[PDB]
Amino acid sequence: VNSFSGYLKLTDNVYIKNADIVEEAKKVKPTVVVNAANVYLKHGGGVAGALNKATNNAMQVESDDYIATNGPLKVGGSCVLSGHNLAKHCLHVVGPNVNKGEDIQLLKSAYENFNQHEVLLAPLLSAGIFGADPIHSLRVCVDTVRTNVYLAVFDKNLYDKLVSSFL
């Protein structure tokens, strides 16, 4: 039993809700919130800009030190950093950005990072400003993640389409 509330159950392990991931994280304080990161951990817009703003830029300061030490992530890769005031940990996961010409096949590799954590609050990877089809992202999530994932979908209209079209 956990403190996630109001989610529709899609499969044994995948749950979904129309919600603002920032407000969800502040309420639940999950062990892990997933950021829709880029390889440079530059949290400018989308989920990343919103999460970073909610930390008063502390996420960006920590991320800049991470990059200075380790260099960029790989597309499809991840790193674990602090969750600041939102969660215990933030798993920064880089899905392919179609608006940069990146290979959509890497979306499965991106979701595999979730399997290293028993329970996560997450967005749909490569959706929104990363330019991939969200119906596809949900399908890859369901077919790749085996741990317990709570998906927050910001746009209410998109949420209804994902539910009604879910196979």
Ligand SMILES: OC[C@@H](Nc1ncnc2[nH]ccc12)C1CC1
């Ligand atoms: O990952 C793409 C995804 N974006 C977000 N999901 C949940 N909460 C959010 N807050 C700000 C952006 C954002 C779009 C809706 C499918």
Ligand SMILES: [Cl-]
């Ligand atoms: Cl977005």
